[PDB]
């Protein structure tokens, strides 16, 4: 019924930097909000109630303000171990209800995604079922964009995909897509492509195969 | 020292009940200002408050699942007790027991979470995965293993029985219209080493007992 709205799921910022969290309530709340902090694996944990007050443990830096429907969180000086998902919540009136949450991830250069294309296997196909799957490797930014073409023709509806969490080491992101066909439909084409476009990418790259 | 431990029965059918027990202690749910409650997350979703109960029997409930939706606490083993009926494949969460607390403000904010107990809704049966290779193409290569229509999560996927770490990308399951899941694990490595180095990766999908290790090769 309160809509609790975090306008980004994802916000960049770097060792030491000061970074605030913003959220928005679809009806006055007064200052009953609470900020929840969850790392990977882990389940959540209370950080601020109250919009502003701090729980007993929870280091100085972070912080909270506001009041009616609008609410910030506040780190000083973002450490390491503050990387993780961000969630408020409205604890002024049932049902309670939290907002969409927002990843806090680390800023580095640019690197563009590396490219790599893998046709179906033999075992697979005599099964029955043709997966192609489309590798972006170790990029930064996050946001990439691929399309799977096949014959030249875009592919829609066919292709599932996932991404890593940004890696602990490098700070890059992976994604991998798989395109499923049936061996039928799989064998009524030629040519299947994967195209990527990129902040670091000043061209787009496209990684292909020919079947068999 | 307050410390919630969720039990529950890790799958079940679609119509099934789902009953989850919270065992608590470091306090009692008998001290006023104090409430014990449930709360959801779905994978790589945000968080859904289902239902808690006061100190004083109390009890609330999220509206849009009050029918299904049962709460119940017994002091007398410091336990709390949830049942939902009926469930469907939405109901497919992370489950949290988590104490609720009244402050001199106002009250309704969660200050000690468990560790959860995963629930996963489904029709499925239990079935070990199909491991595929996924062939280094003819610098830096990458080559992995397709790992296919498995039910449930988890797999754990290793590289040459845990030697290979470095440049490993497993990555998360999707979950296919089938009612399986699939995922792919791949590892990057120097092109010079593509005709002397082995590589397999070890496969382990411990709720079919099952065990799987397959070499991947240039083709």
């Known amino acids: 019924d309160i809509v609790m709205t975090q306008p980004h799921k994802f916000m960049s910022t770097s060792v030491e930097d000061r970074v605030t969290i913003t959220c928005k309530a679809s009806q006055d709340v007064i200052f009953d909000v609470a900020w929840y902090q969850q790392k990977p694996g882990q389940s959540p944990k209370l950080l601020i109630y109250s919009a502003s007050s701090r729980v007993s443990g929870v280091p100085d830096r972070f912080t909270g303000s506001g009041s009616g429907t609008d609410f910030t969180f506040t780190i000083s000086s973002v450490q390491a171990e503050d990387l993780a998902v961000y969630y408020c919540?409205?604890?002024?009136?049932?049902?309670?209800?939290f907002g969409g949450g927002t990843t806090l991830e680390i800023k580095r250069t640019v690197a563009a995604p590396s490219v790599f294309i893998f046709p179906p296997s033999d075992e697979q196909l005599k099964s029955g079922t043709a997966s192609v799957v489309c590798l972006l490797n170790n990029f930064y930014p996050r946001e990439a964009k691929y399309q799977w073409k096949v014959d030249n023709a875009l592919q829609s509806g066919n292709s599932q995909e996932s991404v890593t969490e940004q890696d602990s080491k490098d700070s890059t992101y992976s994604l991998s897509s798989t395109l499923t066909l049936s061996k039928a439909d799989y064998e009524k084409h030629k040519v299947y492509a994967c195209e990527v476009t990129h902040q670091g990418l000043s061209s787009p790259v496209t990684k292909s195969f020919n079947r068999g | 020292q307050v410390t919630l431990k969720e039990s529950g029965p890790g799958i079940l059918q679609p119509s099934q009940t789902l009953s989850l027990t919270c065992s608590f202690s470091?306090?009692?749910?008998?001290?006023?200002?104090?409430?014990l409650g449930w709360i959801r997350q779905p994978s790589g979703k945000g968080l859904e408050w289902l239902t808690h109960?006061?100190?004083?029997?109390?009890?609330r409930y999220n509206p849009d699942l009050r029918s299904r939706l049962t709460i119940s606490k017994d002091t007398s083993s410091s336990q709390i007790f949830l049942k939902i009926a009926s469930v469907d494949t939405a109901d497919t969460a992370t489950y949290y027991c988590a104490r609720i607390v009244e402050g001199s403000y106002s009250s309704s904010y969660f200050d000690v979470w468990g560790a959860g107990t995963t629930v996963t809704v489904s029709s499925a049966s239990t079935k070990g995965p199909s491991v595929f290779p996924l062939a280094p193409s003819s610098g830096t290569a990458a080559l992995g293993c397709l790992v296919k229509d498995y039910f449930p999560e988890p797999v754990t996927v290793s590289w040459n029985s845990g030697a290979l770490t470095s440049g490993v990308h497993t990555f998360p399951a999707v979950l296919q219209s089938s009612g399986l899941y699939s995922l792919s694990s791949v590892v990057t490595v120097p092109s010079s080493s593509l005709g002397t180095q082995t590589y397999i990766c070890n496969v382990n999908h411990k709720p079919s007992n099952t065990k799987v290790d397959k070499r991947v090769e240039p083709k």
């Open positions: 470091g306090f009692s749910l008998s001290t006023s200002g104090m409430g």
């Open positions: 109960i006061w100190w004083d029997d109390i009890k």
């Open positions: 919540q409205q604890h002024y009136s049932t049902p309670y209800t």
